[PDB]
C-alpha cells in the first residue's frame, strides 16, 4: 500500500506538477495535462500518466489549489504515513507547531 518508495514517488510527482503550474502560471489541471502530453506513447507512459489523473487528479487539484505543498498532499492521500512515535518524514521545510492542523485541514478538503 504505502512504503518509502511510494512516498518519494508521490512527493516527486506532486512537486513537478506544482512547479509546472507555477512556471507556466497555469491551473493544476492544465499542469497535469501538460506533463502527460510530454510523456511518450511508448511503454504506456502517456496513458499511465492520464490514468493517474483519472484516479488522483481531482484530489491533487483541490489540495494544490489550497496552497498545500507536496508533503501535505502525499500524507493526505496516504502515499506517506507517519506511524505512531516514528519521526515525521518530509522533503520541504515543515513548521511542526502547525503540521497537524494543516493535515487536519487537508483531510477536510478531500473529505
Amino acid at each position: 500500500l504505502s512504503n518509502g518508495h511510494t512516498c518519494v514517488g508521490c512527493v516527486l510527482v506532486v512537486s513537478v506538477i506544482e512547479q509546472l503550474a507555477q512556471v507556466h502560471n497555469s491551473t493544476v489541471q492544465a499542469s497535469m495535462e501538460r506533463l502527460c502530453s510530454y510523456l511518450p506513447e511508448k511503454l504506456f507512459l502517456k496513458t499511465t500518466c492520464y490514468l493517474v489523473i483519472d484516479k488522483f487528479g481531482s484530489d491533487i487539484i483541490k489540495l494544490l489549489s489550497a496552497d498545500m505543498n507536496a508533503d501535505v498532499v502525499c500524507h493526505t492521500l496516504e502515499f506517506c504515513k507517519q506511524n505512531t512515535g516514528q519521526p515525521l518524514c518530509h522533503l520541504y521545510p515543515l513548521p511542526k507547531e502547525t503540521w497537524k492542523f494543516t493535515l487536519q485541514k487537508a483531510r477536510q478538503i478531500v473529505k
Binding site: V8, V16, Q22, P87, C89, L91, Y92, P93
Partner: peptide
C-alpha cells in the same frame, strides 16, 4: 533540481528525507 525553482530544497534536505524513509 527539484529545489532550484524556488530555492527551497538542498541535498541536505533530500538526504534527510530519504533516510527518514530508509530508502
Amino acid at each position: 533540481p527539484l529545489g532550484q525553482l524556488n530555492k527551497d530544497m538542498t541535498y541536505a534536505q533530500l538526504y534527510s528525507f530519504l533516510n527518514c524513509l530508509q530508502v
